[PDB]
């Protein structure tokens, strides 16, 4: 698909058996989801951006389905104001910016 | 151009006759630049990011070139960690997300 940017590029994702809405964010290095349980090992991480830093849990090798495309990668879980799909997963679905 | 996301989508911008580097950010509603002088009057604005909210100065109808494409619109100035080109200007340059 071709997604215009007149509104926030929100899409449905499937993660940890749950359907959620998330923002396709080219400015994010990482994928960050609001509090939820994920299986496996995790380690703490700090991520920064506008407003400063938040502490999150880093889960590796998490399968995700984004707008119907399956991928795998690291998923961070913590107090983000919005679920964001960052570059680490956007690359896997072949997402590019075009102008 | 077509920009992949294996690395940060950093581009050159020109504002106030000066070249700067900025991130093309589909997750950002607005465009926010690090401290600099801009002409005219400004209005107050609060923006929220991954770590919370920050106060910025809102300047309207600012001429800005983004990766060689001319835009004229709102630019926020404040304590952002990186210069961000958000949707307000990505739409002016005809940028879309594609996969
Ligand atoms: N309204 C909010 C917004 O648009 N804020 C905004 C506006 N204009 C310029 C900006 F910059 C911003 C800050 C966000 C941008 C998003 N992409 C980058 C993320 O990357 C890093 O954090 N670090 C990497 C590096 F930036 F440092 F490089 C840079 O921060 C929006 C939002 C809030 C937080 C986040 Cl995370 C993403 C989106 C939102 C809030 C909500 F509650 C519900 C929603 F649907 C949408
Ligand atoms: Cl990853
Ligand atoms: Cl590729």
From TrEMBL, chains A, B:
InterPro entries cross-referenced by the UniProt entry: Aspartic_peptidase_AS, Peptidase_A2_cat, Peptidase_aspartic_dom_sf, Retropepsin-like_cat_dom, Retropepsins
The answer, when asked if Disulfide bond is one of the entry's keywords, is no
Does the keyword field hold Transport? no
Pfam name, any one: RVP
Can you name one GO molecular function term for this protein?
aspartic-type endopeptidase activity
Query: Which UniProt key words apply to this protein?
Result: Aspartyl protease, Host endosome, Hydrolase, Protease
Q: Name one GO biological process term.
A: proteolysis
Q: Where is the signal peptide?
A: none
Subcellular location, principal: host cell
User: Which SUPFAM superfamilies does the entry link to?
Assistant: Acid proteases
Any one GO cellular component localisation term in the record: host multivesicular body
Compartments it resides in: Host endosome, Host multivesicular body; Virion membrane
Q: Its membrane topology, per UniProt?
A: Lipid-anchor
**Start and end residues of each Peptidase A2 domain:** 20-89
By what name is this protein known?
Protease
Q: Identify the species of origin.
A: Human immunodeficiency virus type 1
Q: Which gene encodes it?
A: pol
